[PDB]
Amino acid sequence: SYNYVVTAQKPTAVNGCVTGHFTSAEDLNLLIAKNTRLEIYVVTAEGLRPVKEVGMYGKIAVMELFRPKGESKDLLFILTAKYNACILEYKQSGESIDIITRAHGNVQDRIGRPSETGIIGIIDPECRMIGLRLYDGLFKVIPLDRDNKELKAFNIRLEELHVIDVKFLYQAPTICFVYQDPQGRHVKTYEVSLREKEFNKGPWKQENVEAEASMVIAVPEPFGGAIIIGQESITYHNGDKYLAIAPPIIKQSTIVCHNRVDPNGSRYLLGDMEGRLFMLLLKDLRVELLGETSIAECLTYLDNGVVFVGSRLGDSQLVKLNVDSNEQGSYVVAMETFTNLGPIVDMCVVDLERQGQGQLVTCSGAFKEGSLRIIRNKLHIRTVPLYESPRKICYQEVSQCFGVLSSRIEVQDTSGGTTALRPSASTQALSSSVSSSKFGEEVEVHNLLIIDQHTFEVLHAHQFLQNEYALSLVSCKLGKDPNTYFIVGTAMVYPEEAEPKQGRIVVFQYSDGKLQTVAEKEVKGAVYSMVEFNGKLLASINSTVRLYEWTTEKELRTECNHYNNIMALYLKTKGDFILVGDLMRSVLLLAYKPMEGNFEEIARDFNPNWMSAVEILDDDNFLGAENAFNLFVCQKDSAATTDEERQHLQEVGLFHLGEFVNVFCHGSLVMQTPTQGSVLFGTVNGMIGLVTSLSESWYNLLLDMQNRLNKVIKSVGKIEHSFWRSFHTERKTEPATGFIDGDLIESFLDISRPKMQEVVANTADDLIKVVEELTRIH
Amino acid sequence: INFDTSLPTSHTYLGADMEEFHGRTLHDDDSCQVIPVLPQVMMILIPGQTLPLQLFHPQEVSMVRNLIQKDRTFAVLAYSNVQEREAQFGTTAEIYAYREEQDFGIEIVKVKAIGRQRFKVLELRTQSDGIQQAKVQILPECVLPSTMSAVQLESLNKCQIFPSYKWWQKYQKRKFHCANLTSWPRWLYSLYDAETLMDRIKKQLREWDENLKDDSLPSNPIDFSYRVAACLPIDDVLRIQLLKIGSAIQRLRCELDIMNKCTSLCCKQCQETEITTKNEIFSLSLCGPMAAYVNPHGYVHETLTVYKACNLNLIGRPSTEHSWFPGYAWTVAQCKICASHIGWKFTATKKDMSPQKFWGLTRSALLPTIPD
Amino acid sequence: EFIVGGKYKLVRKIGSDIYLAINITNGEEVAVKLESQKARHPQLLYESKLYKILQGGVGIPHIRWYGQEKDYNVLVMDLLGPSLEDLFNFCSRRFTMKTVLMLADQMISRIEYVHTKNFIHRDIKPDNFLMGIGRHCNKLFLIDFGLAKKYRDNRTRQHIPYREDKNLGTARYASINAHLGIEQSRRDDMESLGYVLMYFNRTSLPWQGLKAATKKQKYEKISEKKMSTPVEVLCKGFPAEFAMYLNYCRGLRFEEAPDYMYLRQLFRILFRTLNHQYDYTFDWTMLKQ
C-alpha cells in the first residue's frame, strides 16, 4: 500500500472560458477552466498574455464573472463539483500576485437527486443573487451581500421537475427556463423574492416551445427577453413578442454553445456538435455560417475579430473572423492552436529513439479531432491528425509500426450504402483491405490501421465487417511460431439485440506492406479483451475467460474455458495470475493450473461502483479507477491462516484523483531510488499521471509533510486539502488512505523560504533534496 | 382471464379481516440488532413479500404476542441446511396484519408479515425456552449514480434529458453519448443501465401477465428488482445467492440472466423429470405469477401458476376447501417417477370461468434447468 | 386429535380398521389401517412387508408409511374406492354377464401378479377387490395381504411341501381342499376366484344359508354341501365356460401352475360371443347415469 501518485501532464481540455475585467478595471481578460486549473489571460492586440495560473482543490463546475455595486473590477464565482462555492478577487502589489478569497462555503444538501441536465450556475444581471440548480425540484439561491461571507443559501420548491436550461432575464430578478413533461416542452418565467423566500408569478405567460429546446439565451437591453434554441428552430420570446425562425443551415447538427458578441446583444456566436461556427444576428432574426473550428465546448469573442475556441474533444484555438470586409465571404482562419491531449482513450509506451528513455503514444480526441500524440520528455507533443476516432493502440517492434483500431461515422445512402462525412485515416490509407462479408442514419465503421513508427503515415487500413465493433487489440507471438501478429477481438452489434451473441478473433500479419488475414475464429459473444499469456492467447468472450493455443497448423485451439459470475471487460495478467474485472468494480483473481490445464479462482472482491480501469501493480496489489474520479488499491494475502481470508482482497488505497482514468500503463518517461515501480495513466481531460510505490518509512514521512504543508499553503477558495482528496461517491465520503499527493509534496519547492522553515520545524534544505529527488520520477 | 387477480392476494381464505397496523419499523443501515426467529418457518423471504402464517404451538403464539407489542419484527433465516440449523443470511419480517382466534379451546393466531431488510447472521442463540434470538447485521441497499454522469461534458449535459424501438435507440445514443470519451462502447453501458435492464424485464413480465406495465410495476430499481426476485421459481441455493446481491444493477442483471438461460422446470427429486417450461408461466394473482400461501395446518407453499404441466399424476378428487384461488378446486399432484408432491391442479367450479383448468406448483418441489 | 406419521390426521373410520386420513402438508387423502400393538391377531407389520414385495404390479396399492403411533401399528396407504361387495349391494345384489366377464379379467390378472412374486393370497373374496379413485376408477385392486403365504422359493422356485392338517378365512369362498385341511397353493386361489364369480352370477351360493351354532358347525355344512353339489349343478343355466374354469382349477396338481392365458381366454372369447365391448361401463356406472 502507501503509494505515490503525481501529475505528469496537467489537464489540457477546456471545460469553460469567460471574458471580463478581473485583474484590473482596465484590462480585458480571458479566464479558462481546465478541471482543477484556472488560467488567467490579458487580451492584447497581438494575442493572449499569460498573467496567473492557479490550482484549486476541486473540479471547477461553475465559473462566472460579476461586478456588484461598489466594486472597481469584476469578481469571479466558482463552485466545485464537491459543492464548494466561493468568490475570488485578483490583487497584485508590485510583482506579488495573489488570488484572495472574498467568501466561501459548501452548498450541498443532505438530501437530493442530482439533476439530469447537470449543475447550472447563474448570476443576476444586477448582482442581487446567484441561482443554482443542483438537484431536481429545487432552485437554490445564495444572496449577494457583503455580510454573506459564508455563502448561506435557501431552496425554493420547483414544481417543474425536469428543467433543461435557465438564465436570469435582462424589474424584479426574473428567471426564464424550459421544462419537459407529458404535455410537451414549454418556456416559463418566475420572479425570485429574497424577502418572500419563494417564487412569484413571472412577467410573461408560459409558451409552448419546440420539443428539442436545449438552450436559453438572455438578451440584454434594449432588446430584452430570451432566445430559445432547438434542433430545428431559433425563437425569440420577450413577453408578448414572438419572432420564430427555422433555418435549414442548423438542421444537420445540434448547437451546443453560444456567445454574445455585442454588449447590446446584437450578434451571437453559435457552435454545434460538429465544429460548424454560426453567427446569430427585435424585428428579424437570422443565422450565418462562418466556418469550421474545433468542436467547441465553449466560445468567447475577445476583440477585433478574434475568438477563443475551447475544445473538450479536440484542440483549443484562437481564430480570426472576417465578418466584415464584405468583399470576401465570412471565413474562419486559425491564428493559434493549443495542445489538448484529451480524451486519452488508450496509450502505450515505446522506446522509439533513445533506446533508454520511454515515449508515450496515445489515442486522443474523438471524431474529427481524432489523432495520435507522441509525448516525450516541459513535455513535447507531436499531433498526427486522423479525422476520426482512435480507440486502441499497440506497437509492433518487428514491423517497426503501430497497430491502431479506430472508428468513423458514415451516413446511409439513398442508393443503398453509406457515405463518409470527410476524408479520414481509414479512408486515405496507401493500402486498404476489407473483410469478407457473409435514410441518413449514422453508421459506425471500424478499422485496423497500420502506422509507420517513424513517419506516422497510414500504410494499411483494414475495414471490418458491417455492424462489427472492434473491441480488443494485441501484438504478440504465439506457440512455436516465429511470426509476430496483430490480433483483433470484435463483437457483432445489431440494434435489436441487447447482448453480443457473435464475435471474432482475427489474426492479421503485416509483411512487406501487405496485411493479410492469417486466421479467423468465430466465437459466440463479445471479445472484450485479449492478452498474451505465456505463449497462449487469453480471450474473454462475454462472461467466459478462454485460453487458446496456436497450433502448428496456424490455428487457435481451445485449451480450457472458465465461466465466471461476471462479464470479463477487463483482463490483465502477471505470471500465471489473471485479473478479471467488469464495469461494476467486481474484481476477480484466477490462476492457471498447468498440471491440470484449467483455472482456479484465488480471490474476489465485489463492491458495486463503476470501474473505469484496472492494473496489476505487483503480485499482491491491483490498482483501479472508480466512480466519481477515484483511485483504489486492492491486496491479496496468500499467507493467511484461514481460507476465507486468503480468498479475500482488502481495500488498501483510496484517493480522490479528480480525473477520469481510461488506461493504466506500466512504464516511464525518464531515462532508464525511494520509489518502486511506475504506472502511467491517461484521463478524459488529457491529464497524464504517475503512480509509484513507497516504503512505510517514506510514506509516513511524506504524510506528516502533507499535513504541515496544508497548515501553511493558502488554498484558493479556502478548500481543505483533506476534503478534496477524500474518496467520493454520492452515498459515501471517506478520507483518503494509502496515497501520497505528490502534487502537494512537490509544491514545497514553490513555497517561500520563511514558510519552508515553518514546515520543517520538527533542515529545510534537507527537505528540498527529498522533494527534488521525488521530482526525478517524471 | 375471467377470475379476479385480486382475490388471491387478499388471502380471503384465511378468514375475516385482520387487525392492520399502519406504522413501520426500519433499523438504521449496518446496525447490529438481535431479533427472534419463528421456529418452524423455512422460507427464504425476499423483501417486499407477504408471508401468510398460522401459528399453533403455544411458544409461537406467545412470541407473536410480544412482537405485536414491541417493534413487530422477527428474523427469517435463509438456511444452507435446515437440519444443520445453519444460516448466513436472512431477512427481517414486520408483522402488519394479525388476528387471534380461540378454536376448539386452543388459541390460534393468523398473521401477514412483510419482508423488510436483508441481514447477515452474526450469532444465533437458542434460549432456555426453546425460542431462538438472532444476532443480525442489517445489510445496506446499494444505489449507484448513472454510469457516465461523471464523464459528462457539462456542455453536453443536454443529451441527458430525453424525449418503442426507435425511442430506445435515441435513449442509448443520447444518455450514453459521453461513452465517446471512455474506452467502452455505448451499448455496453446499456448492459448496466437500470431503466434499460428493467424495460427488458418488463418485456418478459408482459409475456406472463396482460397487465399494463405503467401502474402495477414500481419505478424504483430497488423495489422493482425485489418484486421480480420474489416471483422467480428458482431453487434455494440460487435465491440465497440472489439475496446476497446489494446492487439492483447486478440484481436486475442476474434476474434477466435467470429468465433467459433457465427455461425448463423439473422435479427436484428426479432432477431429470421435466414438469413445465417458462412458456407456460402466467400470472393469476396481482402480486405476479408466484405468491406465498398458508395451508390450514400452517404449512406455507410458494405457488407458481402454470397453464400446463406434464408427468404429473393426480391423487384423489377435486376439493374446494382452502382454495388459495377461490372459485377453483384442487387435486394433489405427484411426480410420476418418484411420487414426490409437486403441487396441485386447480379445476374450475362454474363453466363460465377462465382459465377452466390451471396448475399450482410449489417452488420447493421444482428445479430450474438449462436445456441441452 | 390423531395425526399419524407427522402428516395424516384421521378424519373418520371408513372401514373396520380402515380410516380416512388427510395429509396436512398437501391435503391428499390417504387410508390408514390401525392395528393395536399387543393385539390378538397381528398382521400389519406382515402386510407392510408384503406390500414392499408386491410394489410395482398394477392394481397393488402404494404404501405411504408404516410405523408406530401411540399404542398402535399404523399402515398409511392409497385411498381406494368401494369393494366389489359394496358395489354388489349398490346394484341390488345382481351383476350382468358383462360386468362379471369384465371383472373376471382383472381379477384373474391381479391374482396372477401376486402369484409371480411367489405368494398365494388365501383370502380371495369380493370384500378384498376394490376399484380405485379418480384416475383409477376402472382399475381393480386386490388388497388385504394378511393371509398371504409364500408357496415357492424365489431363486430355486422349489415349491412348498404338500401337507394336510391345517385350519381353513372366509368359508364361503374357500377351496374344497382347504376345507379338507389340505395346504393351499396357486390352484386354491383360482378355485376361490371361481366361487366368487358364481356368487355374482347367482345372488347366492348353494352353501350360503346353512346355519349352525358354532363356527366349526358353520364350516362343516358348507364344506360338505359344496362337496355334494356338482360343478355342473352349481353353474347350471350359466355359460359353459364357468363350469370349465372350475373343472380346470380343481383339475390342477398341488405344485402345478395355472394356465392364466387359458382361463382369461375362456371368458374373453365368451365376452366376444355375447357381442360386448370392454368399454368400462359396468352395472354400477349405469346406476350413476
Ligand SMILES: O=C1CC[C@H](N2Cc3cc(Nc4noc5ccccc45)ccc3C2=O)C(=O)N1
Ligand atoms: O388452494 C389450495 C391448495 C390446497 C391447500 N390445502 C388445502 C388443505 C386442506 C386440509 N384439510 C384438512 N386436513 O385435516 C382435515 C380434517 C378434517 C377436515 C379437513 C381437513 C389440509 C391441508 C390442505 C392444503 O395444503 C391449500 O391450502 N390451498
Ligand SMILES: [Zn+2]
Ligand atoms: Zn420426481
